[PDB]
Design a protein around this ligand. Structure first.
Ligand SMILES: c1ccc2c(c1)Cc1c-2n[nH]c1-c1ccncc1
Length: 281
């Protein structure tokens, strides 16, 4: 809309480009996304406007004009990928990691309770502000409408057509590990490299740990068989409570994977607080 003055491109996705923009008539600063128009898309996106929660980036307006689709979102000041890179030397303080994980699980528990999945969680769509808040962005968009495979759940990689809310828990678990170790957990650069990286760390799944896995669409009996490795080796700095929680977030069987709601009650969050991040914007 000519109702906005584009300041700068704050990113790009496959579902569209995102810009920092100012509302030409109200001076308000926002994140303007021009979607890259079916009625179903319009209806699903319209549903997202009501899905409001303190840990979900607010969708301010939906502008379907001149047969185009623009999404006006609230503008935060930093995404988690940049914050992680900037904190690479010391690493994000554990209390902050815990706070962020707790908040994101609250956001997920909320959307999941409304049957809405994100499907593509990653540091780039997790936005933070100076007050210690972290929020889920660009979600509900996947189902409504190089791509990184690093946070993709194994059931999606094995070809499951109807995945559940568990896919989000898996992605968040990978991000949790990344914040703690300062290295991506499963940095695959292809679908099979991604799958095998997961197998080499958590062990090749079988019917014992994941009933029904061998009949999944893309499963091959020829998959090499790797043994699982201790979480003590995978996320060393993390204490037992965090390790136990992470292990339940990375269960192979989606039905065995912990829910966001249950994760909130895990002992790991017994001492959760809300520290302020060291931001440089
Ligand atoms: C989709 C929907 C809303 C938003 C985004 C993507 C990215 C984004 C969104 N809102 N604010 C920001 C942002 C702020 C500062 N630095 C990077 C990004």
């Amino acid at each position: 809309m000519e109702n906005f003055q584009k300041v700068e491109k704050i990113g790009e996705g496959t579902y569209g480009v995102v810009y920092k923009a100012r509302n030409k008539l109200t001076g308000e600063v926002v994140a303007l996304k021009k979607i890259r128009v079916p009625s179903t898309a319009i209806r699903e996106i319209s549903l997202l406007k009501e899905l409001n929660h303190p840990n979900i980036v607010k969708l301010l307006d939906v502008i379907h004009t001149e047969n185009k689709l623009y999404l006006v979102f609230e503008f935060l000041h930093q995404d988690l990928k940049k914050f992680m890179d900037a904190s690479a030397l010391t690493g994000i303080p554990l209390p902050l990691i815990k706070s962020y994980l707790f908040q994101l699980l609250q956001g997920l528990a909320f959307c999941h309770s409304h049957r809405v999945l994100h499907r593509d969680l990653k540091p780039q769509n997790l936005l933070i502000n100076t007050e210690g808040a972290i929020k889920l962005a660009d979600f509900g968009l996947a189902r409504a409408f190089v791509v990184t495979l690093w946070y993709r759940a194994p059931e999606i990689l094995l070809g499951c057509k109807y995945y559940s809310t568990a896919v989000d828990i898996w992605s968040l678990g990978c991000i949790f590990a990344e914040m703690v170790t300062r290295r991506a957990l499963f940095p695959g650069d292809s679908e099979i490299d991604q799958l095998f990286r997961i197998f080499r760390t958590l062990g090749t799944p079988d019917e014992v740990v994941w009933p029904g896995v061998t009949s999944m669409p893309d499963y091959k009996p020829s998959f090499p068989k790797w043994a699982r490795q201790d979480f003590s080796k995978v996320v060393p700095p993390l204490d037992e409570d965090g390790r136990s929680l992470l292990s339940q977030m990375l269960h192979y069987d989606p039905n065995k994977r912990i829910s966001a709601k249950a994760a909130l009650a895990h002992p790991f969050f017994q001492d959760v607080t809300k520290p302020v991040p060291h931001l440089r914007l």
